[PDB]
């Protein structure tokens, strides 16, 4: 990529068009002012994946971001794409969990172990093909190449280093093939011809000789090149936007068939057209599975709060004391795995304690009602948790129960849930069980 | 001997460069830091690159410490394109060779002088908390480091007690209507100084310059105080670099001291001096080593108490700034000195509705209150209430300058 050749043009400003590169650093409108592109950078396939929902009515995704400007910019584009459904079934994309890719150049199992739990039958990301080949054997070791696991990667898979590969049946795309240099040259020639047909509406310096003043008519030509629409190119109607952005409204869809990119369909403007020859899946299926399997394990966190919760030390056998009520009926016990916290600080014991009170019998009755299984935990912080500002990062972060639930580390919470605007903003709520003041 | 190079495009002060050289007191020398060049009134950057190839033909050069008497950040971008690409660590103290605006490369080695834009914004917060004023607007043009700039300022306001509750940002990438939209007694602004003439013409058209409103700009668009456009209004205060006492023999001695200290760590702890290069493209076979060549000793240097630590912003972490006020005669007049998170007092010119108010402490109508030293000196809903410094009656009893905060009925 001839970067300083482009960088010299930013002083005697010249309208430049980009032929080959899909790097997102060239979309920066501060330094790359007039540097258009025949091809959008790789964030366009995030818009392709936003088209991929309501192709087969798909509604869950977990992402992995390359810790780089490319993955962050693609994440920003898809985040802006997800701001929709302002009406007027609510089965749109709702999983939306994000993890990080680029430190997975050595170990990805810490991410994949979290990925295999949270009801994911989802596609994830485009990545560097070498670490993609690492996660292809890693997730196959963790058995994420199964039948229900839907898999789609993007553009960098098609490189030959990804041939420690991709369980058979995984969808690839081809937005712009475009690599006819006749079609690359002459369509740009038509674009600049329709440009100069309006640039004839009535001078740059002598290059790099003394005069370092900006040729202002270049930036004035930029607004005219914001009108040079060439609807009759070899690649069809050539369009533009404020920063490159060819706006090619077609792609072509293929999947692997014993490492053969067998085409599944195309796109046409607004019509995703599947030439449905064969539907392959990583478990060799021919259906179109979606959603997930709903689990039944719920790990509830809490803090010791009488008389809602009675954390009590267990006996020498680990079980609670067989204590009774006032009528001789035994109080229902639950071995609650607390934090270390048999003392302030970090005690050596991390001992599961007992649990009595309101919410224990309430949760037992609710588990018998809803007919689901059961786990427990206690909060290590011991605080309700406010949105405290993280130091030197200007980010206000919750703590306590909301330090675990909003981080996804915990399941549903029963608590003395004091309700405000902000907790309702981040946590969906049930109706108030016990009215208070 | 260590071939280093200095050039200031415009000056004629070689005797100051010899006084900054001053090679007799150097008891602690490494391999000898030789430095000699000639100046050339030329802004052509390709000529500068051929002069870089000329220095590599002179075979001694490893790094340079040079500047120019203009305000051109484009050559700082060129340095980021080229010298940050190949090898070269460059320090520059004048104008656009100090004003870095666009970016800093990740594989860079050079550095330009001046404080961070958010650090300068913190200086504005310090002086405006001294004067107890509050911005109730903001206008800002498009410039690199703007969203994080306004996020840092607003997030600093959210943590405070008394903040700048305003009239959120009008980014200027209906001009008279948009400048008539926001109103404030004290207005914080940023705009490029070349565009600031037209922007101040629009501000004079909407009358914002005539409402007794004060305008505060950062130093990077407060370029050199000897030429001010007439459309730039009066009474504008700004914080800037020390144009008064920091000249050539200070800056060349500082650059050569930083370079020689980086040397006398790099060739001493590790006993490894890098090799000077000869070509400007064919030297690539040994400068591929993004390696131990990358300096750690560059980011921590002090010489005779003058510290220089700098972060990854292209800005140092211990700056010394002066506060200048634009007069009606297009004259930038120094009113205050900002050392590291502290101010100076001498010229607190704070400025009919101005009426004198006298009172005496009687409960509960009055001050029952001290001044908190840290978090917003007069805390909340309490006007600052100056008191005469009752001293020994041979010097002057100072009116004001010991203050309290009035609450009461």
């Amino acid at each position, epitope marked *: 990529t001839p970067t300083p050749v482009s960088y010299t043009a930013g002083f005697y400003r010249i309208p430049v068009l980009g032929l080959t590169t899909r790097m997102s650093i060239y979309s920066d409108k501060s330094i790359h002012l007039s540097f258009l592109r025949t091809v959008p950078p790789y964030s366009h396939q995030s818009s392709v994946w936003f088209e991929m929902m309501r192709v087969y009515n798909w509604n869950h995704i977990i992402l992995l971001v390359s810790d780089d400007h490319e993955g962050r910019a693609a994440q920003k584009r898809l985040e802006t794409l997800l701001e929709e459904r302002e009406s007027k079934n609510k089965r749109g994309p709702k999983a939306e969990k994000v993890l990080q890719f680029d430190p997975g150049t050595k*170990n990805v199992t810490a991410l994949l172990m979290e990925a295999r739990e949270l009801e994911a039958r989802v596609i994830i990301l485009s990545a560097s093909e070498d670490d993609a080949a690492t996660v292809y054997r890693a997730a196959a070791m963790l058995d994420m190449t199964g039948s229900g696991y839907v898999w789609l990667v993007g553009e960098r898979e098609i490189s030959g280093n990804a041939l420690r590969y991709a369980p058979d049946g995984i969808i690839g795309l081809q937005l712009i093939n475009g690599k006819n240099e006749s079609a690359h040259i002459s369509d740009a020639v038509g674009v600049v011809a329709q440009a100069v047909h309006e640039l004839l509406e009535k001078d740059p310096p002598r290059g790099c000789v003394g005069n370092t003043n900006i040729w202002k008519t270049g930036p004035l030509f930029k607004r005219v090149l914001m009108s040079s629409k060439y609807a009759d190119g070899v690649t069809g109607r050539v369009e533009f936007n404020e920063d490159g952005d060819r706006k090619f409204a077609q792609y072509s869809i293929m999947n692997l068939q014993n490492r053969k990119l067998v085409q599944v369909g195309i796109y046409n403007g607004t019509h995703v057209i599947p030439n449905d020859r064969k539907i392959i899946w990583p478990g060799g299926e021919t259906e179109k599975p979606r959603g997930y399997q709903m689990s039944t394990r719920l790990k509830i966190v809490t803090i010791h709060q009488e008389p809602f919760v009675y954390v009590k030390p267990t006996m020498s056998d680990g079980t609670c004391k067989e204590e009774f009520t006032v009528n001789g009926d035994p109080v229902k016990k639950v071995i609650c795995t607390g934090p270390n916290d048999t003392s302030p600080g970090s005690p050596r014991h991390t001992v599961p304690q007992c649990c009595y009170g309101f919410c224990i019998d309430l949760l037992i009755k609710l588990a018998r009602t809803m007919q689901f299984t059961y786990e427990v935990h206690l909060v290590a912080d011991g605080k309700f948790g406010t949105q405290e500002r993280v130091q030197n990062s200007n980010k206000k972060e919750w703590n306590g129960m909301m330090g675990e639930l909003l981080s996804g580390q915990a399941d549903m919470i029963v608590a003395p849930l004091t309700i405000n605007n902000e907790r309702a903003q981040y946590i969906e709520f049930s109706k108030p069980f016990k009215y208070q003041g | 001997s260590i071939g280093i190079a200095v050039i200031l495009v415009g000056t004629s002060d070689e005797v100051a460069i010899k006084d900054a050289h001053e090679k007799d007191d150097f008891h602690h020398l490494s391999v000898v830091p030789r430095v000699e060049l000639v100046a050339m009134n030329e802004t052509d950057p390709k000529s500068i690159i051929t002069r870089i190839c000329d220095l590599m033909s002179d075979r001694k050069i490893q790094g340079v410490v040079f500047a120019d008497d203009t305000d051109q950040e484009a050559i700082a971008q060129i340095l980021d394109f080229i010298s940050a690409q190949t090898l070269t660590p460059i320090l520059g103290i004048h104008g656009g060779s100090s004003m870095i605006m666009a970016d800093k490369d990740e594989s860079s080695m050079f550095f330009q002088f001046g404080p961070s834009i958010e650090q300068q914004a913190s200086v504005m917060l310090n002086i405006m908390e001294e004067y107890d004023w509050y911005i109730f607007s903001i206008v800002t043009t498009y410039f690199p480091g703007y969203q994080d700039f306004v996020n840092k300022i607003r997030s600093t306001i959210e943590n405070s007690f008394v903040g700048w509750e305003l009239e959120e940002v009008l980014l200027l990438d209906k001009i008279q209507n948009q400048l008539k939209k926001l109103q404030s007694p004290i207005i914080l602004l940023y705009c490029t100084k070349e565009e600031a003439t037209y922007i101040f013409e629009v501000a004079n058209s909407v009358g914002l310059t005539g409402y007794g409103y004060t305008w505060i700009v950062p130093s990077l668009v407060a370029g050199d105080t000897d030429t001010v456009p007439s459309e730039f209004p009066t009474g504008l205060i700004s914080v800037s670099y020390d144009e008064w006492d920091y000249g050539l023999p200070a800056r060349v001695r500082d650059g050569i001291a930083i370079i020689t200290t980086a040397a006398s760590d790099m060739l001493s702890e*590790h006993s490894f001096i890098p090799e000077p290069k000869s070509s400007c493209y064919n030297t690539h076979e040994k400068r591929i*080593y993004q*390696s131990n060549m990358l300096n750690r000793y560059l980011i921590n240097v002090t010489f005779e108490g003058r510290d220089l630590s700098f972060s990854e912003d292209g800005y140092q972490m211990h700056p010394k700034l002066v506060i200048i006020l634009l007069n009606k005669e297009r004259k930038w007049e120094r009113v205050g000195k900002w050392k590291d998170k502290s101010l100076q007092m001498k010229y607190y010119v704070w400025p009919d509705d101005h009426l004198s108010i006298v009172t005496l402490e009687e409960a509960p109508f009055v001050i029952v209150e001290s001044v908190d030293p840290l978090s917003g000196t007069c805390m909340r809903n309490t006007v600052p209430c100056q008191k005469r410094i009752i001293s020994e009656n041979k010097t002057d009893e100072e009116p004001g300058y010991i203050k309290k905060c009035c609450k009461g009925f």
Partner: antibody
Framework: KLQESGGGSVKLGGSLKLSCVVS????????MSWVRQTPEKRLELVAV????????YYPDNVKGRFTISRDNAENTLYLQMSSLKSEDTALYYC????????????WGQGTSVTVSS | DIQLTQSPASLAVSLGQRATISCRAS??????????MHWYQHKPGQPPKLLIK???NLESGVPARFSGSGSGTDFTLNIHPVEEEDTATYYC?????????FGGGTKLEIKR
């Protein structure tokens, strides 16, 4: 590639010139150093020299004891040991050639020096 | 000076197992873009050859079963799989602002 030689038996406080032969590369394009490997599996890095010898480095025990020299024509740079003690009884290697590059990459089979009376 | 501590000093593993070779330091020896170390191997009858650069970067053609990582003070190496030819003598040498400290030195045994 490389061959460190010039070893043998020497008394306490004796002298020995250790040899280090360049085999198959240009010699003044990098940095030199020398290591000594004890039978107790401990690294005694001896000294650092420059390709012109303008940067000679010793550690504290090597300061006042041992001497490095150059043979730039034959490309066999030497270490001249003196005031030898029983802790200097070790194998002896070399360490060079990272090409600025301020690490060291080439170690050899080396030679053995013993210091006993 | 920053000191290197390596464990287990007499490593005995099986072939095919992802063998973990840990290295702990006394101070952080890294930055955002790089780090100064070099990990390597030899047989005791063999010359030392370089294997791993700066934390992980590979030299000339070592088998890629060895995969080293770690940062700050910790440093690891994943041998997956283990070969029978790994009865080596080896450590890493600290170089961060001091190319003088060397590792503790672990040795290889094969539980086969």
């Amino acid at each position: 590639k490389l061959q460190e030689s010039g070893g043998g038996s020497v008394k306490l406080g004796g002298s020995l010139k250790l040899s280090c032969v360049v085999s198959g590369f240009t010699f003044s394009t990098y940095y030199m150093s020398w290591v000594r490997q004890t039978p107790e599996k401990r690294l005694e890095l001896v000294a650092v020299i420059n390709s012109n010898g303008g940067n000679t480095y010793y550690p504290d025990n090597v300061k006042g004891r041992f001497t490095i020299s150059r043979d730039n024509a034959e490309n066999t740079l030497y270490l001249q040991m003196s005031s030898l003690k029983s802790e200097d009884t070790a194998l002896y290697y070399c360490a060079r050639r990272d090409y600025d590059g301020f690490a060291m990459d080439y170690w050899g089979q080396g030679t053995s020096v013993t210091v006993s009376s | 000076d920053i000191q290197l501590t390596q464990s287990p000093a007499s490593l005995a593993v099986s072939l095919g197992q992802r063998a973990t070779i840990s290295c702990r330091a006394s101070q952080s020896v890294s930055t955002s873009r790089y780090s100064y170390m070099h990990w390597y191997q030899h047989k005791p009858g063999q010359p030392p050859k370089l294997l791993i650069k700066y934390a992980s970067n590979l030299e000339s053609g070592v088998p890629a079963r060895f995969s080293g990582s770690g940062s700050g003070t910790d440093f690891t190496l994943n041998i997956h799989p283990v070969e029978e030819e790994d009865t080596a003598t080896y450590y890493c040498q600290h170089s961060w602002e001091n190319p003088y400290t060397f590792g503790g030195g672990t040795k290889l045994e094969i539980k086969r």
